[PDB]
Structure 1
């Protein structure tokens, strides 16, 4: 896109607020919303078939911007974003394996293990690279993936591309952001592994991310659409009988946009 001047005047700036609820695998408006189902493990790579509801998927939404029509596009210049409900992890009473399980004593162990925190702000869908731990994993039909993807899918294969077009069906473990594309998206990711890792979460309303590139240009919203994506896996919930499910948290978006003149 050929980028001309920032068009100033009244109603040249707009703010949107939005939230993505996590898609950890268990369904909406049932007792385990925000959790996955209990994780099963295969005996080998050949027979690996992870059941639906046992693994997280990316959350995404298209935010409709004020109607506009050289033309004007909305340009996203800055954002605030927050993981919400971090306060809930101070819960060590709700059906958790205890610190001293043998002695039937102590607090629950809380949420612990893997953390995966990622968000993207763009003017088109987030662009994805298929990459999996085990290529022979058979994903369920509810999921969007590349079927029979081959051994090369265990690392970077330039043919195995996609775009984040549906909320709660692109498995986190089978798709990542594509650094060969996403010129019109900003993406940010942090992974900390383990199964006994303590989660580390910060929250403040005073931190701003600038979305402008090296040329001072932000994501440009094609079709007057602003695209938000995340995954916010906090760790595992561990029950008394040692069963383990993913726990995730919702994510808050504030985005500021100004009118940009473009060819």
Structure 2
């Protein structure tokens, strides 16, 4: 067996290597579905990376080939510790009284990861089809009313980091034969975040037939989104806060027909 370890940093909207890395810009809200254009930096996008596995040289001297098979993984949200910070420029519990701790991060949690032998296959689906996404984002333009629910025509693949809006794409259950994905959403803008972390939990990646994801072209595809909640400033402006995710994937060389 071979083990790989990798991380994905969150893509909440603000640029890397600058003071708000890990956050979105402050969120603005439209008055109407017909005048809805979320500016670049104000919404989270999916993280993804392709890991290069050791090259498996193919002979074609036999009727079978070798592929790396992902048999199990561990994954952890990292930096959960930082959410014990209730002093950094936060709206206070008694804000009208300039007293108490910061309220910290609260609101919606969206945590999903995927491990596969090819890019994650996506279904386009949006809350408001008339939202105009910015040029920086990868979306289906003029998607139509059908995109507010399931439309079999509206497909994509997660081929780039930090550009596919979380609010416009999710895993396609009609595909992803060669990917395992897991997700949880808890909504509501005052909801406390609930996160666990341990190095003792393994997730088996074998399907009903005892086969894990098979890494096409010796590539292992990792994808995630880890929205922890909102940061609220003293002036009540709110931004997404994300955390990075750790992956440990155990692979074996498998003979494939």
Give 5+ residue unaligned stretches, structure 2: 58-63
Counterparts of 1:73 and 1:118 in 2: how far apart (Å)? 26
Q: Deviations over 1:146-186 (max 9, x none)?
A: 00000000000000000000000000000000000000000
Equivalent in the alignment of 1:155: 149
Q: Distance in 1 between matches of 2:47 and 2:146?
A: 26
Deviations 1:211-252 (A, max 9, x none): 000110000000000000000000000000000000000000
- 2:32 aligns with one of 34, 39, 44: 44
Q: Deviations over 1:186-215 (max 9, x none)?
A: 000000000000000000000000000011
- Deviation string 1:69-123 (CA, Å, 9 cap, x unpaired) is 2110000000000000000000000000000011110000000000000000000
Following TM superposition, by how much is the alpha carbon of 1:142 offset from its aligned partner in structure 2, in angstroms? 0.1
Q: What is the CA distance between 1:33 and its match in structure 2?
A: 0.2
Q: Partners of 1:77 and 1:64 in 2: how far apart? A: 17
Distance in 2 between residues matched to 1:101 and 1:37, nearest whole Å: 22
Q: Distance in 2 between matches of 1:245 and 1:254?
A: 30
Cα distance in 2 for partners of 1:101, 1:232 equals 28
How many pairs align?
A: 251
Counterparts of 2:72 and 2:169 in 1: how far apart (Å)? 26
Cα drift, residue 130 of structure 1: 0.1
How far is 1:31 from its partner? Answer: 0.1
Structure 1: 4+ residue segments shifted above 3 A: none
Q: Identify which of 174, 183, 190 aligns with 2:177.
A: 183
Q: 34, 40, 48: which one pairs with 1:60? A: 48
Quote the Cα distance in structure 2 between the aligned partners of 1:102 and 1:19. 40
Question: Distance in 2 between the 1:46 and 1:102 partners?
Answer: 35
What RMSD over aligned residues (CA atoms) do the two structures have, in Å? 0.3
The whole-number CA distance in structure 1 between the counterparts of 2:229 and 2:197 is 17
TM-score relative to the length of structure 1: 0.95
1:28 deviates by: 0.2
